[PDB]
């Protein structure tokens, strides 16, 4: 028995094993576009992924993750509301059983079909493990996905999902360029938050892009063919692996645009 997204181990149950689930800076949250404050002091985001080195893709039972080599400043995020350099370590998605749901963050209560999370850690802390224990340890770039035209740069990812259908499976995934998953504009909203999966640590500086990317119905459909279960067990489709919006509490969402 452990956490998941089912009726008996879902998000509503997480607080029993992870008390911080009821914390003061939990994520995701609903972004109220009319209450968000435009902050003129927010610097443009700086994304340097030209030297990114992907290593492997794996199904960990909660989602599928694409891991990168973070032993050097190959793929980093700077600028915006950030102080210092943050290295990309992995990216994963959150999707639904239907196109009308799937994203974790919502915009004026609107839900998207999926949400992409590019996770980076503050190099000042030496490694990911140390970074998660700090209030400014991580920086997660959130990108919304809507169903429409296919996204060419996502196809390499969808085609390998068949090889990691069940929990525990992993496969070599080299030379994948994450720049193909970025929207045209880098305008964003930012607020202090947490990881959206256990341990739910409050060490994240969220950067959510305003412009979503479009993916085809066929591409998202392949996401839905993955399994939460491990091989040799009753099949449970990996769908709706998203956490519902949490209380904003004493926090303000800032916008880089007006």
- Tell the smallest beta-carbon distance from residue 203 to Zn ion (Å): 14
Task: Kindly name the residue from 1, 2, 15, 62 that is annotated as catalytic.
Answer: 62
Cβ closest to Zn ion, residue 76 vs residue 208: 208
Q: Which residues bind Zn ion (CB under 5 A)?
A: 117
In terms of Cβ atoms closer than 10 Å to its own Cβ (0-12, 13-18, 19+), residue 100 is exposed
Is 8 known as a binding-site position?
A: no
Question: By C-beta, is 25 or 117 nearer to Zn ion?
Answer: 117
Q: Is 196 annotated as a binding residue?
A: yes
Distance in Å from the first CA to the final CA of the chain: 47
Q: Which is nearer to Zn ion, 39 or 128 (CB)?
A: 128
Q: What angle do CA 88, 210, 242 make, to 5 degrees?
A: 65
Residue 190 among known ligand-binding residues: no
Known active-site residue 1: no
Report the nearest approach of Zn ion to the CB of residue 92 (Å). 6
| Beta-strand relationship, 188-193 and 204-209 | antiparallel
Minimum distance of Zn ion from residue 254's CB (angstroms): 21
Residue recorded with tokens 């996502």: 154
Q: How far, in Å, CA of 81 to CA of 44, rounded?
A: 9
Residue 110's contacts (CB-CB under 8 Å, 6 or more residues apart) are: none
- Which residues are known catalytic residues? 62
Annotated binding residues for substrate, written as ranges, equal 196-197
């Amino acid at each position: 028995h452990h956490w998941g997204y089912g009726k008996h181990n879902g998000p509503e149950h997480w607080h029993k094993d992870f008390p911080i689930a009821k914390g003061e800076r939990q994520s995701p949250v609903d972004i109220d576009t009319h209450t968000a404050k435009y902050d003129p002091s927010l610097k443009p985001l700086s994304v340097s992924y030209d030297q990114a080195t992907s290593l492997r893709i794996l199904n960990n039972g909660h989602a599928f993750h694409v891991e990168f080599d973070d032993s050097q400043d190959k793929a980093v995020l700077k600028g915006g509301p950030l102080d210092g350099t943050y290295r990309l370590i992995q990216f994963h998605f959150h999707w639904g059983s239907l196109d009308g749901q799937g994203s974790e963050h919502t915009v004026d209560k609107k839900k998207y079909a999926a949400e992409l999370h590019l996770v980076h850690w503050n190099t000042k802390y030496g490694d990911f493990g140390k970074a998660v224990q700090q209030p400014d340890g991580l920086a997660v770039l959130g990108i919304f996905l809507k169903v429409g035209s296919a996204k060419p740069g996502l196809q390499k990812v969808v085609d390998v999902l068949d090889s990691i259908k069940t929990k525990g499976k992993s496969a070599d995934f080299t030379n994948f360029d994450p720049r193909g998953l970025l929207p045209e504009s880098l305008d964003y909203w930012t607020y202090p938050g947490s990881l959206t999966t256990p341990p739910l640590l409050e060490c994240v500086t969220w950067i959510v892009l305003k412009e979503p990317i479009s993916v085809s119905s066929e591409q998202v459909l392949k996401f839905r063919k993955l399994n939460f279960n491990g091989e040799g067990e009753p099949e449970e489709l990996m769908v709706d692996n998203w956490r519902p919006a949490q209380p904003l509490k004493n926090r303000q969402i800032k916008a880089s645009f007006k």
